Symmetry: none
Subunit: 426 residues, 3 copies
Amino acid sequence: LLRRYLDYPVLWKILWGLVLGAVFGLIAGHFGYAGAVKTYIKPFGDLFVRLLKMLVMPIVLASLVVGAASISPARLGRVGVKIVVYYLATSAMAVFFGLIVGRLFNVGANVNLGSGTGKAIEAQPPSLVQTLLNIVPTNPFASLAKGEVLPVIFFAIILGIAITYLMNRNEERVRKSAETLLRVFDGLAEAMYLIVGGVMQYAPIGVFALIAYVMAEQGVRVVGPLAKVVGAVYTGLFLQIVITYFILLKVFGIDPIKFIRKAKDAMITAFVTRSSSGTLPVTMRVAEEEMGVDKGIFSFTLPLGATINMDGTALYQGVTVLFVANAIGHPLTLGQQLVVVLTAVLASIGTAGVPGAGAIMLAMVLQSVGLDLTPGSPVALAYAMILGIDAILDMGRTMVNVTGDLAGTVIVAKTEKELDESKWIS
Amino acid sequence: LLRRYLDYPVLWKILWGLVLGAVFGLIAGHFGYAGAVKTYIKPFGDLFVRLLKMLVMPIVLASLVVGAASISPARLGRVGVKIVVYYLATSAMAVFFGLIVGRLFNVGANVNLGSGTGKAIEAQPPSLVQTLLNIVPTNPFASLAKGEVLPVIFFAIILGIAITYLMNRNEERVRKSAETLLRVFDGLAEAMYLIVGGVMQYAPIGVFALIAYVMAEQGVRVVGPLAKVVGAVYTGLFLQIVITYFILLKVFGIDPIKFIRKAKDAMITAFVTRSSSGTLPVTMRVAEEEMGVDKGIFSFTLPLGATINMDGTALYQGVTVLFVANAIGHPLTLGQQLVVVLTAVLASIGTAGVPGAGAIMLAMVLQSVGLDLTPGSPVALAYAMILGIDAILDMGRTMVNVTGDLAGTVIVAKTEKELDESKWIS
Amino acid sequence: LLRRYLDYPVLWKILWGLVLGAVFGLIAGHFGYAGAVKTYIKPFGDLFVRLLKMLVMPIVLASLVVGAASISPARLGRVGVKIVVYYLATSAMAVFFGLIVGRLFNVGANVNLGSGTGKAIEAQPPSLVQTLLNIVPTNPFASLAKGEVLPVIFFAIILGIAITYLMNRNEERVRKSAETLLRVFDGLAEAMYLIVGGVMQYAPIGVFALIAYVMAEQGVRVVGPLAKVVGAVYTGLFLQIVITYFILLKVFGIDPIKFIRKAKDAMITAFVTRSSSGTLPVTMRVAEEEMGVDKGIFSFTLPLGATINMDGTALYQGVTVLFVANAIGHPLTLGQQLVVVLTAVLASIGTAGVPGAGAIMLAMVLQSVGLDLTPGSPVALAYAMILGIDAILDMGRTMVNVTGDLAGTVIVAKTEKELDESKWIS
């Protein structure tokens, strides 16, 4: 900080930091400085990551309560059902694309990791209703503490609807009590947006450090087959975007190219900060002035959608579990490869919108299939290299998430005729 | 459509839900559809139990803060501190009588619930002084998360009392701050009461699912023990009146025979209306036109007592916490038969008639004793049975709350020499 | 009469509790009644320790949010940020002097009341940089539940700064929301200060119980090591003055000797009145007449320093945490000492002034450094010894507390060149 580093445009600041970090991690990691980068530089990246998780539970709780207390329950249902159907459709298309692009590259094929047989040949306990019940928290404070985003989303929506029923009562004591509770939650959401805007000023250092460490450690693993997995995530991702989202927007009447030229802001600010609920201010300030959606829509769909958006995750798992499988030499068929729907579309509904969520979810899916031994087996290294390239995969698995969020908000807006057509004329 | 299911008197269609659950469980266990009803119907019961547990913590916290700030010693005079201790003492004695008539009835020994050879190391409990010191929470947020409800009760009462002592200080800043905190907790309590209304709207299907599963799983006895729990509550109430509200009146000089003969009006009106505060005028007037207490007293003891004097709901959940215990094969000890006494009494400040209680104070006492309502556990089924048999308990349980209120008003009027004896001679 | 036991000065009451506890414990130990105090007396000690460990989290959260909203770059001009930087740096150097003097005197190295070698075995402590990173929480509510003090301190400070930045907004809705959130946290902090008043009123019974149990089970040296603690704290305050304040004043042009000779009135008033806000008028009179500072500064610097500039308290913490760590036989490591420095500086932002805010902050630092204050553990007994001696250190802590304010006022007034040189030159 010298009073000028806080005035350079935030987005250009982040991209400048990211490119400088990539160059530093390349030239250093090649000159044998992995230890120095890990020791002096990586802690800044870890501090940035930790900051990007401090402000996810409060922002989710407060912003959902406000976004539900602003909308009347009728429009709230008419919007939420649409946004959930949209996430389901686009996430199913995402899983399909994962199963396709994890094969079209034959990912992790000639990584002969000294193992012919394994334990992932078959495993499918996809307990669906057991997840549809886990949405309901047994103790909402205990679900705040344990960092579960979906039960807190449920409780927040319920509390918001209760408040909007209260502020229509007649006992003027109750009206005031409800207004005061709503103002508490509104103040908390706004303070969290300030905190996020503040963290995105340090982000040009955190991104620099993170990508520097990543490009210093894994700067040589992008030569082997582990490059045909970053290729298989990014090709699958570009396909996700340019097929799913543009097909949808053309179907509903939104011109896709203009949609991209207008989403560029949030697309880029989420491609680098790798967090959906840390770029939530940016995507809201995009849906407000650059897309034209009404506030009573994106005040709820965007914070709800920043969590439950399993396109990047499912596209990330549907191509990374295939890599782990082909790495340990034990194959698996398409139908049996639906360990993604086991976790990504069911277990990983909430944990989508924190950095490195894909890696921890892959750790969650590789342990449920039976592959548990962490220190020695090929399951160790096959997942360790993924954890190493987790940042390069995570920079995109959330750009797609925020693009899908904006596309779903635009869709729910356009169907409800709450989308300002004065912005979409160019 | 659906409004015929909403506007139908709840707490009645709950009993219809229970009896339809019984007949459905019978004709699905006979035909041999136990697996099908366990895999398709029980999820509704699981959802309903999770819904009844998501309320217990926020409702206890908020409602207790509001209640304690309503009755704190910082705003109680002589009559206030003379009626509050009376209400607390008589609620404690109501719970004692509940446990007494639960042990003197073998309430839930005819139920086949609880697995065979569950455990045998349930003994070796903490001492009396230790479970007494465990009332004080070492960390209030840690007690909100861990689900402990008695320490949260203690901390909430402390906070309410502190808030009242604040709202009398001179600095306008701290007065406004305390008043705003109180309005926050009040808004949270009101939102929780609406959510409880919604959950009890859903309760028909939930108790239907739970009862259908528990009947069709084995054909367990449900008519035996329920015809015992009522008949235990009702003689519990008759005992409560004719023992407590007669020895208390005898030790203060008031003839209880004429007291009952003149309070029959409010007694009948509350036994039929089933409303703690809906019958408030009637009892009020029978305290004025016949009992003789002036407005200076019964304008403060009766309104407060219709909210914090719930001796009926201190005996109901005094016998039902024995039913749930004796049915699941976990007989209560003196260490828990005290935690019931403290929880079911301190939570009486945290009531609101039907929505404030709604058999949520029992789901709170159960969690206070350690008996968890984990969806699928025998506690859930022995709780579903009771919450289903709730109309036949409530239509009688309401009658003793208002008699407790009248006894309290008369006792405080007599102990202040205000009660005009001219209405009690001849 | 109870009202007589309350209006006694609470800290002399606590010291009397400690003395009576020592004598009664020695008598019991010589008479072989150790079981009597272990079963009947000690439960009061357990109750006090739990009742005190309760307040740490609500106090730390609410008080830090309010204090941080009191000092922030949003409402701090130039003199504001200068004096705040000075206050924090001086509190930090003061905690450092506390640790140095504590280690030098070897405080509490012969009470040996620990459970032996081990009792907290944890092989690999978090490295220094990991200890720094753990300040930001991955989930602030999780840091609330798990009782981690420092992450909640960081989150609370950040929330307060965001809240005041909001209060500076122009949209009426968000300004009102931020005001209401701050008023909620203000009300919570004030309620916590009332509860602390109550707990410290109860304290003498608790200190009597704890010291009696200690001195009865086995007579440990308490007249000696507490004497060394008092000597070390007074040497610490004297060296704090003679090094920190003299060096700062001389490296800014002030002549320290005449500074001391001028502020004799404020120092002596703070000594004899044992109050830091009750000596505010005399402090302003000294800073205006005898120093030369203009009303532009000493009207904003003194009311701030007598609230957030606690050097005496931040040295008492630095010495007594070392005493507790050397008493239970766990010489604390350097990462732990840095944690002590951080959470003794940042907690000063939210000091209370209620008699006992030194003991509560000591409990806060004990919880933050790793030495849990759970009842029964030897930490409770050593903390009881310190809290008992607290009344003797309080006569000197407020002298350094209000000398730091004057040093800071004079420093900043000379930097701003607003110091009326006619009072210094000769």
